[PDB]
């Protein structure tokens, strides 16, 4: 939950051991790797934790 | 989109008095022999 | 049914040379393609099974009255067993063989402007199987060498990698390439598995199964030619000879 | 889907040959595909862009800033005409100023077309022997080629007959009225709640109701050049007398329809707009398009349905639409047309009359099977939206034969009954609207929004700004054709002249078949009541002992800026004469050859003024009385 | 040059 | 069945790659600009404008001299852009008023009918509210377009102006005068690559009413969209102000395009906006990248990427074809998202044709599904849940431009004198709404011989103290002209008689929120009406007390919903011919009788 | 019957070896048009010059 | 303004 | 008519 002035950035660390992680959200959201441009809002993401 | 004629005599002459009349008449003659076969067959076998 | 039974490039090309163009077209009006329909499949469901009509089904469909429609009907006949409804083409074109239409300039048809992208899209290629795609690529190759568009054919294949992997390897002017080819192009045949008399949900699958069960009936009927039993009864013109080659090849 | 054998006969049964052959396929980038017609209504790019060009033409010729600046002067001039109560035009009313702007622009274009027809008739009569030679000798050639030959053998001053040539030579007063430009930035919806104060009326007098705004936004005027009319006239004419009769017959019909178009805005009802229905799926296997044409300047509409390769049409009356359906009863049938088809609706404005639209529809229906779907749509949409004749010469010839038939006395549509009935419907609608508005709001408010002064286009007392390009000895001549008249009664003509000089003398002359009048005046910035006329039931006038159907008024003035001619009927709602036909126009004949004679004000003398006949003057020098 | 502008310009110069 | 000829006749056409299709467009825009704005008229009226500006009492360092070539060129560009933007705001305010009148029917339309397309819903709403313009098609918008809303044409403004005047080591008065007459080569290059875009309220109602379910939501969306558009326009004027050459859009195509392997690259550089778009079309795959126009410390024009949609290679080799976009960055992004989603069921020709037509001619695609998705994405990009945080980017664009202005001037002040730098890079031309500007009002309403000229006061994107003045030119030697300012509580009538000279009417103060206190009530905008007999030209001037007034944060959807201001009172008029002395002042509506806002009664 | 002998660069056509463009391609969209033979183009091109 | 019209109005004003 | 023209003409006429 965000109660500040503007949009915030949350860092997720899933480790390096798991093969795939699937992220689903209640509402569409944006996720991207560190120091990379953000994409349009989607519902589900598939990620490799070693990324 | 076709015309109707009272007889084959009017039909064959009208096509003759038209552009490419010679080619038209050749087709109309074949239709005539076909119509003659149709008359004999249908009179023999009414449906 | 006869066209779908050909299993080699030699047999398929030989059949296309013998058959005329009137077999590729159909005189039944049919329906229109690309229409969402509800069909009845009672062996599986009580409700109506949704599906979409296409040009690849084995049922005759209304087709456009142009060269694009004529080529789509020829490829549909090769890959599905039935063509489309394009009437009043002319007896001069209808007498000639399917191969002659595809690879001869003497017929008079102009096919240079044809684009393989929309033809593959219209003749739905995402719904074809491996054997159907190979036959379509044969027709594209024959057309391309007819109008001298070999370079365009190569670029189209390079754009679509899966098509390149299964593309048959033969030069349309050389008969040695047809002999050496060992692709399997048969869509119907005697099945090693157990083929039953049951319906399939899709329009394409149901029609394909009807052709498959029909071929089994024809295979065991009196119209089939058993070479091992009556090879001396065929005429000398149509007897299988290695010296035999396609005309002009 | 068709090939031909080499060394075969090139003749074909069909007379109209499609650019795409029997195979119905044209290789893109070839010459045949380049000369193919383009869809203007269906294509969004061409329809969007076409409106841009038409808007530019209207704005370049008529400027909104200029019209607003001249409102004060026009109001003063219209007040200078001392008109009986219940007949004055008060330009301070917002609604009355609007209708004058539409009327003035529409009348000027119609008036200019009549002038051009008059010179054309003069040139034809001058070369009677050679005109009759061309008409009789050549009959197998196309109508366009015959029109070119006629315009060459005469001093037509406009030799080109093509659409590009017609647009090249066209005056600023001819460009059609573009409705949306007139109604831009104009107040709508003044709310005065139970206030009869003089200030409350003044602000309400300054606005218009929303119904008038819709009418203007769906208004476009049609004016047919005399060069386009010559092809239908010369397609079956055997003599110059027959050809002149056809030319006058067509313009009489165009005269009546243009008057009807203005009355639609005056009545106080929303005029419908033409539209096209296309299927939702652009890449549809089964293609159908529907065209519903609602000509504002006319009395009969047309619905054209093209289903596959079959063309069907229906002509319907624009009066009597009491029910919820827009279409009235159908007068001519050409198949079954379904107006309930669902799809995208695209609105367009026609630039051809109902007769011209109907003429092409019959021609296309005759050649439904010979032409491809693209050619049928392209030719129809080009003519309707651009007034562009088809490139197919065989198709063009058939259209003009049908155009002649619908105009001639053997027409399947009896236009006089429908034009008369539309007039009765319009006046009944105006009466119903006025009394309906009289109950809802006050009688003063009703007169503000729906005025009873205006009524018909030529019944309304309008002004025509004149343009002068000929100057002789420092005196510029301004021309104005008096007549013909569609109504009978007493009519007054006035002239207003503004010039830079503090004092000056300007001369006005009125030419008949016998001689001129030679009035001389010196007043400025005020109408002068130059000449007064009376009109018979048949539309003829006994001017100085001779029956006349039209006169030429010429105004000479030095260093002038603007000359305006005003016109007003004595009684409101002057009754209309019967529209003339081919028989009426050839029954009687008048000579307009005398209208080109001009005088030199600089060399005029006192004894020269007055009514003088041609015998008094010598050969040439129509200014000096001594022979 | 408009009619109204000419009329008022002449009136201003004369009166 | 069909032959297939009609389908090819209605296919979209490439209007950028086709050189025939680029020449035709450029001619029409040039013709449209010259007809409405003439170079002869503007140049001749230069002296009249110069005396008007000077007659306004402006402190030193805060006054503009149109005697300078650069100051004059900047003003005509500013006046043209402001007039078009101002006209759109009045149209929007009128549209909001009609919706509020019929909120009951509008609410029913927004709720009951949801299966119809965006265009169909807009047409039903426009018909119900009885708006002046009832057409949502491209042709209808073009037909019902005022003279002032025509986009400004770059090369037309820069035509025939002296460039590159050389005086050497001279401080003489005459040399200064000849130096000021010319303009620098940089400003000429900027004007040659400048084209403006002003979107109509009818075009905005489709995105606004695609998901709305209440009249308040529909009104709030309309206000939120136009807040972004005005901020982007303000950035556009500031870009030409600083001493930098603006980048201009181009398309890269193969030198020898192949039939079956062809690729297209589009680089959109919206002059009115803080972000750009790069779109690549290879095969049936579309990839887009949204970059930031600020920064760009390196030689490459593109800044950091703020939204990714794939990999776009901007280093491709091919022919370069140049164009100016008629759509905003939001509209271009909205279409490229819909095209990407619907790339499978569209052909190559449809993908290129639909994209080029929208960017170059502001033409929406004829596909119904494509249009619905485009407007759904347009609403998302301008809402509070947008993938792009606009307020951050517009703010960063402002700081980047001011930094460039300082370093460009300081670089020149070293190379030449202070006077030379000042005449080439003015400090009084910062921002479109910050600068002192004039509005040539037009009037088509005459009440009892009095022509009415309407003007919209605000809304304000800057805070401080503002001053408004009028210049009235009338053919008569002596006249009496009135100015009426309408608020919510009541209107204020003043009477003046001075002619051919600016006269201050209103002194206003606006706070951080952008809301002024007009006679004890908070207002966000006011209406000024001027009544003159036989007027020839009426101009309204605006200026801020301090130079470069600080900015006011742009308002999003929730800001517009929170505060509601009534605009119904802007419609009523007064009749000056029936005015009295006792009726001249600030009076409220409860004083007046019903329907007569002229006499106190 | 004139032989200039001037050196000329080789031209690569948009149509290809078949010398005819493929339907619905980028090349067919950028092919030159005939502005004289087509009446719609010629009738227009008169209008713009008159307006100018 | 046209040249003739300017000359004409200047003549009116002076004389 | 322009603003600068009107101001010049009024000066000429009134003087």
The minimal CB distance from I6 to the residues F41, F47, F473 is found for F473
**Sequence-separated (6 or more) residues with CB below 8 Å from residue C238:** none
F303 token code pair: 């800044």
Chain D residues inside the 8 Å CB shell of C89: 1-2
State phi, psi for F48 to the nearest 5 degrees. Answer: -65, -40
Answer whether H12 touches E (CB < 8 Å): yes
Q: How many CB contacts within 8 angstroms connect chain B with chain D?
A: 14
Residues of F in contact with D26 (CB under 8 A): 5
Q: How many other CB atoms are found less than 10 A from the CB of residue C198?
A: 10
Q: Are C36 and C109 in contact (CB under 8 A)?
A: no
* Backbone phi, psi, residue C126, to 5°: -75, -15
Cis peptide before D400 (omega within 30 of 0): no
For residue I12 the two structure tokens come to 């000429």
In angstroms, the separation between the Cα of residue G30 and the nearest Cα of chain C is 16
Tell me the nearest-neighbour CA distance from B40 into chain D, angstroms: 31
- Cross-strand bridge partners of residue C48: C40
What phi and psi values does residue F492 have, to the nearest 5 degrees? -125, 120
E neighbours by CB contacts (3+ pairs under 8 Å): D, F, H, I
Residue the block writes with tokens 């039993």: C229
List the resolution, Å: 5.7
Question: F359 near F521, Cβ under 8 Å?
Answer: no
Kindly report the nearest CA distance between residue I8 and chain H, in angstroms.
11
Q: What residue of D is the nearest CA neighbor of F24?
A: D49
Chain F positions in Cβ-Cβ contact with residue D194 (cut-off 8 Å): 594-595
Q: Which residues of F296-329 are buried (b: 16+ CB within 10 A; e: fewer)?
A: eeeeeebbebbbbbeebeeeeeeeebebbbbbbb
Where do we find the tokens 């410390």?
F297
Q: Helices D210-217 and D94-126 sit at what angle, rounded to 10 degrees?
A: 30
Cα–Cα distance for residue pair D359/D380, rounded to 1 Å: 11
Hey, is the C-beta of D4 within 8 angstroms of any chain B C-beta?
A: no
Which positions in chain E touch H8 (Cβ < 8 Å)? none
Whose tokens are 């295979």? That residue is C219
Tokens 């080591």 sit on residue: F169
Cβ–Cβ contact C184 with D under 8 A: no
Closest residue, chain C, to F285 (C-alpha): C159
Separation of alpha carbons C144 and C150, rounded Å: 5
Alpha carbons D591 and D549: distance in angstroms, whole number: 10
Nearest to D71 among F5, F357, F446 (CB): F446
Cβ neighbors of D104 (< 8 A, separation 6 or more) are D462, D463, D464, D465
Q: Say yes or no for a CB contact (<8 Å) between I3 and F48.
A: yes
Select the residue of D73, D525, D561 nearest E1 (Cβ to Cβ): D561
F322 backbone dihedrals φ, ψ, rounded to 5°: -110, 145
CA angle at D141 for the pair D137 and D143, rounded to the nearest 5°? 105
Residue C173 CB burial class (10 angstroms; 0-12, 13-18, ≥19): exposed
**Dihedral sign from CA coordinates of D380, D383, D386, D389:** positive
User: What's the rounded Cα separation, in Å, for the pair D610 and D520?
Assistant: 10
Question: Is-contact F225 F188, C-beta < 8 A?
Answer: no
Instruction: Give CA–CA dist G7/G16, Å, rounded.
Output: 23
- Other CB atoms within a 10 A radius of the CB of residue F547 amount to 17
- Is the link from the previous residue into F459 a cis peptide, with omega within 30 of 0? yes
Q: H/E/C letters for each residue in D406-474? A: HHCCCCCCCHHHHHHHHHHHHHHHHHHHHHHHHHHCCHHHHHHHCCCCCCCCCCCCCEEEECCCEEECC
Residue to substitute from A7, A8, A37, interface F, most F β-carbons within 10 A: A37
Q: How far apart are the first and last CA of chain A?
A: 26
* CB neighbour list of residue F386: distance below 8 Å, 6 or more residues apart: F380
Nearest chain F residue to D53, by CA: F28
Judging contact as 3 or more Cβ pairs under 8 Å, the answer for C and I is no
Judge whether F430 and F238 are in contact, CB under 8 Å. Answer: yes
Resolved by = cryo-EM
Q: For residue F251, give the 3-state DSSP assignment.
A: strand
G17/C151 touch (CB, cutoff 8 Å), yes or no: yes
Place of tokens 């010559």: D230
Structure tokens at D238: 């055997």
The closest alpha carbon to D543, from D598, D595, D597, D482, belongs to D482
The residue of chain D with its CA nearest to that of H11 is D501
Q: Is H7 on the interface with I (CB under 8 A)?
A: no
D-chain residues near F95 (CB < 8 A): none
Crossing angle for the helix pair F19-36 and G39-51, nearest 10 degrees?
Answer: 30
Kindly report the nearest CA distance between residue E7 and chain F, in angstroms. Answer: 10
CA distance H14 to chain I (A): 8
Nearest-neighbour CA in chain G from F137: distance (Å): 23
b/e string for F265-285 if b means 16 or more Cβ within 10 A? bbbbbbbbbbbbbbbbbbeee
Distance, CA of F118 to CA of F526 (rounded, Å): 32
How close does chain F come to A44, measured CA to CA in Å? 16
Asked whether at least 3 C-beta pairs link F and D within 8 Å, the reply is: yes
**Are F389 and A36 a contacting pair at CB < 8 A?**
no
On chain D, the residues whose CB falls within 8 A of the CB of E8 are none
Q: Which residue, among E3, E7, E14, would best test binding to D if mutated, counting the most D CBs under 10 Å from its CB?
A: E3
Question: Among candidates F250, F137, F336, F193, which has minimal Cα distance to D49?
Answer: F137
CA D422 to each of CA D271, D319, D336, I12: distance values in angstroms, whole numbers, following the listed order: 14, 6, 25, 58
Question: Which residue in E4, E8, E11 has the most chain D C-beta atoms within 10 A of its own C-beta, making it the best mutation to test that interface?
Answer: E4
Instruction: Determine, for residues E12 and F536 on separate chains, whether the beta-carbon distance falls below 8 Å.
Output: no
Q: Which of C64, C118, C159 comes nearest F347 by C-beta? A: C118
Contact across the interface for I10 and E12, Cβ inside 8 Å: yes
Distance from CA of D219 to the nearest CA of G (A): 22
φ, ψ dihedrals at F173, nearest 5°: -65, -40
């Amino acid at each position: 939950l965000n109660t500040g002035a503007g949009a915030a950035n949350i860092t997720f660390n899933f480790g390096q051991i798991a093969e795939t992680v699937i992220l689903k959200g209640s509402v569409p959201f944006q996720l991207a790797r560190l120091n990379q441009p953000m994409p349009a809002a989607r519902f589900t993401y598939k990620l490799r934790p070693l990324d | 989109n076709v015309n109707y004629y009272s007889s084959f005599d009017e039909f064959i002459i009208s096509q003759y008095h038209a552009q490419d009349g010679i080619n038209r008449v050749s087709t109309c003659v074949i239709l005539g022999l076909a119509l003659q076969a149709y008359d004999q067959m249908r009179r023999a076998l009414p449906v | 049914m006869d066209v779908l039974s050909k299993g080699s490039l030699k047999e398929l090309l030989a059949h296309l040379e013998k058959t005329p163009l009137e077999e590729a077209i159909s005189y039944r009006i049919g329906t229109v393609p690309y229409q969402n329909v509800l069909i009845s499949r009672n062996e599986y469901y009580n409700q109506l099974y949704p599906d979409t009509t296409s040009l690849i089904d084995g049922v005759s469909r209304e087709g456009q009255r142009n060269v694009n429609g004529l080529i789509m009907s020829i490829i549909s006949y090769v890959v599905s067993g039935s063509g489309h409804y394009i009437p009043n083409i002319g007896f001069m074109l209808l007498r000639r063989s399917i191969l002659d239409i595809l690879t001869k300039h003497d017929t008079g048809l102009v096919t240079n402007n044809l684009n393989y992208g929309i033809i593959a899209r219209n003749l739905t290629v995402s719904k074809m199987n491996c054997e159907q795609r190979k036959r379509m690529l044969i027709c594209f190759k024959l057309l391309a060498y007819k109008d001298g568009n070999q370079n365009d054919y190569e670029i189209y294949l390079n754009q679509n990698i899966p098509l390149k992997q299964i593309a048959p390897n033969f030069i349309p002017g050389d008969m040695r390439t047809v002999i050496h080819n060992q692709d399997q192009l048969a869509i119907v045949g005697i099945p090693a598995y157990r083929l039953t008399q049951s319906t399939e949900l899709s329009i394409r699958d149901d029609n394909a199964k009807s052709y498959k069960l029909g071929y089994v009936d024809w295979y065991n009927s009196n119209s089939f030619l058993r070479e091992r039993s009556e090879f001396n009864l065929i005429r000398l013109k149509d007897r299988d000879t290695k010296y035999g080659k396609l005309n002009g090849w | 889907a068709w090939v031909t054998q080499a060394y075969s006969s090139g003749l074909s049964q069909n007379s109209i040959i499609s650019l795409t052959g029997n195979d119905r396929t044209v290789a893109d980038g070839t010459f045949n595909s380049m000369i193919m017609p383009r869809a203007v209504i269906a294509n969004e790019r061409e329809h969007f862009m076409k409106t841009r060009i038409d808007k530019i033409e209207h704005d370049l010729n008529r400027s909104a800033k200029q019209e607003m600046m001249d409102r004060q002067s026009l109001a003063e001039d219209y007040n200078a005409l001392n008109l009986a109560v219940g007949q004055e035009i008060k330009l301070d009313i917002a609604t009355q100023h609007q209708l004058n702007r539409l009327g003035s622009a529409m009348y000027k274009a119609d008036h200019e077309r009549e002038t051009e027809l008059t010179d054309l008739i003069n040139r034809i009569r001058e070369n009677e022997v050679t005109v009759n030679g061309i008409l009789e000798n050549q009959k197998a050639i196309t109508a366009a080629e015959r029109a070119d030959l006629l315009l060459e053998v005469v001093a037509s001053t406009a030799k080109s007959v093509s659409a590009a040539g017609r647009a090249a030579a066209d005056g600023s007063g001819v460009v059609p009225v573009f409705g949306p430009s007139v109604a831009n930035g104009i107040k709508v919806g003044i709310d005065i709640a139970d206030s009869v104060a003089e200030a409350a009326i003044a602000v309400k007098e300054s606005g218009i109701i929303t119904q008038l705004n819709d009418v203007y936004h769906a208004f476009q005027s049609v004016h047919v050049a005399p060069n386009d009319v010559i092809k239908p006239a010369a397609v079956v004419a055997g003599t110059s007398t027959e050809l002149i009769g056809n030319l006058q017959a067509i313009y009489s019909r165009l005269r009546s329809h243009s008057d009807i178009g203005f009355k639609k805005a005056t009545v106080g009802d929303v005029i419908p707009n033409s539209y096209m229905i296309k299927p939702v799926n652009s890449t549809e296997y089964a293609s159908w398009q529907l065209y519903v044409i609602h000509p504002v300047q006319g009395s009969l509409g047309l619905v054209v349905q093209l289903m596959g390769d079959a063309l069907t049409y229906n002509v319907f009356a624009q009066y009597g639409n009491t029910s919820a359906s827009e279409f009235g009863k159908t007068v001519l049938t050409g198949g079954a047309t379904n107006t309930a088809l669902e799809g995208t609706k695209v609105k367009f404005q026609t630039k051809v009359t109902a007769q011209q639209a109907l003429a092409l529809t019959m021609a296309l229906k005759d050649a439904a099977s010979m032409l491809s779907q693209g050619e049928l749509i392209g030719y129809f949409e080009q003519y309707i939206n651009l007034a562009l004749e088809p490139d197919n010469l065989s198709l063009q010839d058939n259209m003009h034969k049908y155009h002649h038939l619908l105009t001639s006395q053997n027409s399947p549509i009896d236009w006089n009954y429908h034009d008369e009935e539309m007039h009765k419907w319009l006046d009944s609608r105006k009466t119903t609207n006025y009394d309906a508005m009289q109950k809802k709001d006050g009688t003063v408010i009703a007169d503000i929004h729906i005025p009873k002064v205006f009524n018909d286009l030529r019944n309304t007392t309008l002004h025509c700004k004149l343009e002068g390009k000929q100057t002789i000895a420092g005196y510029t001549v301004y021309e104005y054709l008096i007549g013909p008249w569609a109504h009978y009664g007493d009519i007054d003509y006035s002239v207003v002249v503004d010039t830079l000089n503090e004092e000056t003398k300007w001369y006005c002359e009125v030419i008949g078949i016998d001689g001129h009048l030679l009035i001389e005046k010196s007043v400025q910035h005020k109408p002068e009541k130059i000449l007064e006329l009376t009109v018979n039931d048949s539309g003829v006038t006994s001017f100085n002992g001779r029956n006349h159907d039209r006169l030429k008024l010429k105004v000479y003035v030095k260093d002038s800026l603007s000359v305006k001619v005003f016109r007003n009927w004595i009684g409101i709602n002057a009754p209309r004469v019967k529209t003339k036909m081919f028989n009426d126009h050839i029954g009687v004949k008048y000579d307009y050859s005398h209208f080109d004679k001009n005088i030199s004000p600089a060399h005029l003398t006192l004894t020269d003024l007055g009514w003088h006949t041609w015998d008094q003057y010598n050969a040439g020098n129509w200014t000096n009385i001594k022979p | 040059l408009s009619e109204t502008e000419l009329r008022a310009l002449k009136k201003l110069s004369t009166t």
